[PDB]
Amino acid sequence: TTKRKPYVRPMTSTWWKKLPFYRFYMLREGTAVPAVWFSIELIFGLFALKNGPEAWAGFVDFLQNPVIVIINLITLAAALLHTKTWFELAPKAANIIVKDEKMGPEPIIKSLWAVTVVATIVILFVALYW
Amino acid sequence: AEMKNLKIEVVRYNPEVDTAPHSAFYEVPYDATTSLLDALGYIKDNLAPDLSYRWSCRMAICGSCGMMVNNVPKLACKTFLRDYTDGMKVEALANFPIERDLVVDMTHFIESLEAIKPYIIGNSRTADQGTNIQTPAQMAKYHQFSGCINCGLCYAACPQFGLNPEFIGPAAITLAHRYNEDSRDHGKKERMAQLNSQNGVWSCTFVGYCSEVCPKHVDPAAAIQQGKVESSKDFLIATLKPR
Amino acid sequence: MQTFQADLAIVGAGGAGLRAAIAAAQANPNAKIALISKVYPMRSHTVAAEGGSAAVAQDHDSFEYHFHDTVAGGDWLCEQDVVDYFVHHCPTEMTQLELWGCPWSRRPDGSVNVRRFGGMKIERTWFAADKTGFHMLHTLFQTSLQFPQIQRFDEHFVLDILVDDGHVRGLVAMNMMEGTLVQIRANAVVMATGGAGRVYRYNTNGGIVTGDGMGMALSHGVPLRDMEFVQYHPTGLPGSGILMTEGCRGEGGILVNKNGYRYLQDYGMGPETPLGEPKNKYMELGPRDKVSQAFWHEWRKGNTISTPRGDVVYLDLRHLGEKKLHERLPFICELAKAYVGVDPVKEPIPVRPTAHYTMGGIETDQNCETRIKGLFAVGECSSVGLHGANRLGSNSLAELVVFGRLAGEQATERAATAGNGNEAAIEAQAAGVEQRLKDLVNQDGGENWAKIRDEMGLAMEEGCGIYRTPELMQKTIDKLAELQERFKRVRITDTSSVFNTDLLYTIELGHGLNVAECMAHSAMARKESRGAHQRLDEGCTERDDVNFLKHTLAFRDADGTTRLEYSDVKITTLPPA
Amino acid sequence: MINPNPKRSDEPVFWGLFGAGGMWSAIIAPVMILLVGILLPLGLFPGDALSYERVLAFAQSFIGRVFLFLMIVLPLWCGLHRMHHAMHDLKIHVPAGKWVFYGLAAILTVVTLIGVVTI
């Protein structure tokens, strides 16, 4: 019989608390929560919008809390962290050759942020100047 | 002159005596040139002849060196004591069963690498007709992904592999991607089943630590994401083939 | 011992072993091939080669020019019929590697590029950036994964071969993880174990290039040919001995002394060439031996720079430029940064000559076969008679696939016509190996194997280096003999079974001592100067084709003595003069 | 050792959704949270831009219906996909987790669809 006794170290549910690189990963996926929470909020607003001004005002009242204002500010932060990390990661899915050389990610990261900026401006214009 | 000394902690384990791994500590002379691999030889030569570990090239090209240094997967021959004056603890490469001291069972890695058919498939050209024509532009498509030295540090870095020992892993998928992306190969379909498995690219949540530790800058993470894109194109094609 | 049946057993999975395994699987699809190695195949030393591998490719070249380069580079000690076969099959094997995927560097039109190495007038070295060994070895390893005939015994340490009535019948190996002995029966065994550069204190080799295969052959009456010719590479890093490819100079790097002087102009390799344009044959691209000898001469004059790791000269590459450096010397740069802490863009790299390649090895005929029927040797552990007294740069890697293929095929045939042997005799051989192993394990004496290791290394460096004298060679022969006596007083204090490396390094050390004595004795008797073997004593400082245009054969008898015999060199079209 | 004929995973369907959703909430989520979660409730807008009548006028337009749907739904298919996998990362056993998180997505998607064809 073998004299070998392979020792398998166990992996705990707290593995990610160790290294910062893992923590930041957890944090990144964590943005998922405020994001769905915001989708839920929009659904409230959408159905308050349909139930007449009376209900709509009750929605706006909710958004005024102001504990809900904090949660929403946290939500905005989370969303930006998502945008920040999403843009760095997306370029890796493409393998593009520009003159005998594999390029990116910088050219792509720059374009996405350019588009967000323009989008943030066009939406704000459209929703407030008229 | 007078060489400084460093107390290194090495996690020993003898399956014929120990019930579990346990630390030992050794005083090792050193300078600005001393590497972990240099330190381990000094220990085996003067302090504990029963210290076992893998190594060979001494120049970070063979890949047999991997181990944990303060919980970071690294190559002992590319790790230097001058950087660990406040403490250095050495352990066997994470996520692999420990066999004895710093040696771990690499069988899963080997089988994983074998399962993706890492060889040119389906090209009928024969030696007498000369070599294939391939341009810098075509080679650039896979070149970076061919620098893998099978050292396994990416398997130690991946938390997904530690949670799912059946995951074929970062290097294996990168290797598969390297052949899929080579204009001379025609055997992408022979590799997809494994990349489409749940134990394939889909077991990856893009933690990205593998790329961060590659001593050869292969960027296995980029390979996997790209694999996901191909696995997805494959899934559609299959869904649309009522043929 | 558990036994295993195979048509052929290959000891060694580097370039040669792998190319041999594939040839054998393609020559006989039904064969059961046992590929053995003490490290996983991809960790073999082939992985480290950086310059390239030779093969006639340009239109203005000729098989005759590669033929002549090899013969002259070997100072006429090459078996001219083998050299001919070699050059003629290089193109086929480099191309075939390409078919298997090897990513050789290319010309913009997609044809493979080629550069100059070993001083060849017409460039013909194919290359994968400056990671050629890495790419050849992996391509080879990975390609072999598709042949089910090849059954690998990874991390199996072959202890001995089994011989009876002049024919090989298998081998005994140790499953390293398990610590158990195993018997592999085969009628053909190919030795592809590598060189012996680790008997030198400072070298460019991996820890596993210990000369095991050579030692095993010595034990069975097979001689080692031309062992006195040890190739030094002129540019290695102090202490680690790590190699800095000749490619640093083919790209215009310079070698200077403590005065910043390009000393090579005063040793017959002038006139100086402008930083811009380096010329083959001149200055830093001068004859390999003259460049290493210049170092020793500089050292005598006190022109080397003293450092903590030893005296060196400087390999200055700054004037190369980022683009060039990173496009043709990415590896060299990271090695330099990591092990000597130097940026080849900002500072000069400290270097000095280092033991690098073993020319001599297991004696074989033109088909890689040895004097024991069924036993072959290919690759760096052998002597097919290709390199003479000095290997030509980029000929070794070519050799691995050209003769590895030959070995695989010839062994295949040999095992098919072998016929059976005396079973009790064979089994007795196996019981023999096992007993000798217990003997070594039970040996006591309190001697530390590692210090013997260190002394052997120092001896080879002092007595069998760049310049040799009968006083110092003799001193080395005396040292090794002493170290052989001590080896018997070594105690392997680790009696564990799971990956016991203490025991393995101790066996490896045994082969080294044996192998090193053949080198020192071979060198002490060659009362001439030829190729890598250069002597400073009166009446020995020159080449002597009248009395030494012959090969050295070194045998080891059962009484531990090293005896020499001499053989003739096959000439075909290029007589010496 | 390793299954020679593994079952093709269905992840490419959720991954794809999650991909489009992750890209949509990367580009458009920040501004929307600004307007709705902050500017709206704080009166920080000119005149009657974000007044009931104006929002309703917008939500009832075609482009507004499509926009509200996608703004609500794409992010959901992204976030639920991540919470699904977070469960595994955290080693939290969730029975029929694939049906739970993706079902919730589908339920909420339907609920939203009803909403933009109007209540």
Ligand SMILES: Cc1cc2nc3c(=O)[nH]c(=O)nc-3n(C[C@H](O)[C@H](O)[C@H](O)COP(=O)(O)OP(=O)(O)OC[C@H]3O[C@@H](n4cnc5c(N)ncnc54)[C@H](O)[C@@H]3O)c2cc1C
């Ligand atoms: C740093 C460096 C760079 C070089 N660059 C070049 C170059 O650019 N061009 C060129 O032409 N040449 C070059 N060379 C020389 C050439 O690379 C080598 O001569 C060649 O690679 C040797 O290959 P090999 O097949 O004989 O075996 P190796 O690659 O040395 O492998 C030997 C095999 O035998 C196995 N083995 C050994 N002993 C045992 C045992 N006891 N039991 C079981 N298995 C065993 C090992 O595990 C291994 O698998 C270089 C050499 C070095 C050191």
Ligand SMILES: CCCCCCCc1cc(O)c2ccccc2[n+]1[O-]
């Ligand atoms: C085309 C853009 C794709 C970029 C997506 C980012 C990669 C990515 C990031 C994640 O957090 C994941 C978590 C679970 C499963 C898959 C994941 N993927 O693929």
Ligand SMILES: O=C([O-])CC(=O)C(=O)O
């Ligand atoms: O070292 C190099 O780059 C080339 C050389 O001489 C060899 O063939 O080993």
Ligand code: SF4
């Ligand atoms: S990808 Fe990088 S880390 Fe992973 S095995 Fe290959 S070389 Fe090592």
Ligand code: F3S
């Ligand atoms: S760390 Fe693991 S999760 Fe994917 S990005 Fe690398 S394989």
Ligand code: FES
């Ligand atoms: S010894 Fe080769 S990778 Fe470290």
Ligand SMILES: [K+]
């Ligand atoms: K040799």
